[PDB]
Amino acid sequence: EAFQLTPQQQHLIREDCQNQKLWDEVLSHLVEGPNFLKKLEQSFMCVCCQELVYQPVTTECFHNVCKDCLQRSFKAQVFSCPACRHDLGQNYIMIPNEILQTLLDLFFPGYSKGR
Ligand SMILES: [Zn+2]
Ligand SMILES: [Zn+2]
After folding, report:
1. Residues lining ligand 1 (ion), CB within 5 A?
2. Distance from residue 52's CA to the centre of ligand 2 (Å)
3. Which ligand minimizes its atom distance to the CA of 50?
4. What does the alpha-carbon distance between residue 109 and residue 33 come to, in Å, rounded to a whole number?
5. Ligand 1 center to residue 6 CA distance, Å?
6. Start and end residues of each RING-type zinc finger?
7. Ligand nearest to the CA of 52
8. Which ligand sits closest to the CA of 62?
9. How far is the CA of 71 from the centre of ligand 2 (A)?
10. How far is 87 from 3, CA to CA, in rounded Å?
11. Closest ligand to the CA of 64
12. Domain boundaries in the chain?
């Protein structure tokens, strides 16, 4: 009755090492069965737009934020992590975490429409 991860999800979670600590916390909730998807969605909620992160950038301070939302923040001369306020620097290279994107697409098929 525990939520059962597919081989694909197990593979990608392993490969998503920038999020290692977070994934280990998230998988605590596999026991919660169908409700795991809910706690999963809450874990990858974006602090800026308050939706499941889309094209997430995983920051060096371990926070996932939509690339679009971090770009809005920088344009407003804020070079800080919106989740924890760690200074990222004006020159920060924003690289989407495509492993995490693919994971979210697997867990929530179709969620990214229109984003
Ligand atoms: Zn966002
Ligand atoms: Zn942060």
Report:
1. 46, 48-49, 66, 69
2. 17
3. 1
4. 18
5. 27
6. 46-85
7. 1
8. 2
9. 15
10. 37
11. 2
12. 1-115
Ligand closest to 72 (CA) is 1
* CB atoms near residue 42 (< 10 Å): 11
Pick the CATH number of 1-115 from 3.30.40.10, 1.20.1060.10, 3.30.780.10, 2.40.340.10: 3.30.40.10
* Spatial distance between the Cα atoms of 96 and 41, rounded to a whole number of angstroms: 18
Q: Rounded to whole angstroms, how far apart are CA atoms 64 and 43? A: 9
According to DSSP, the β-strands at 56-58 and 64-66 are antiparallel
CB 52 within 8 A of CB 44: yes
Q: Which two tokens stand for residue 13?
A: 């979670």
Structural contact between residues 82 and 73, judged by C-beta atoms closer than 8 angstroms: yes
Residue with tokens 């690289």: 95
> Which listed ligand is nearest to 63 at the C-alpha?
2
Strand intervals (E) in 18-88:
56-58, 64-66
Give distance in angstroms: CA of 4 to centre of ligand 2: 30
Packing angle between helix 98-107 and helix 7-15, nearest 10 degrees? 150
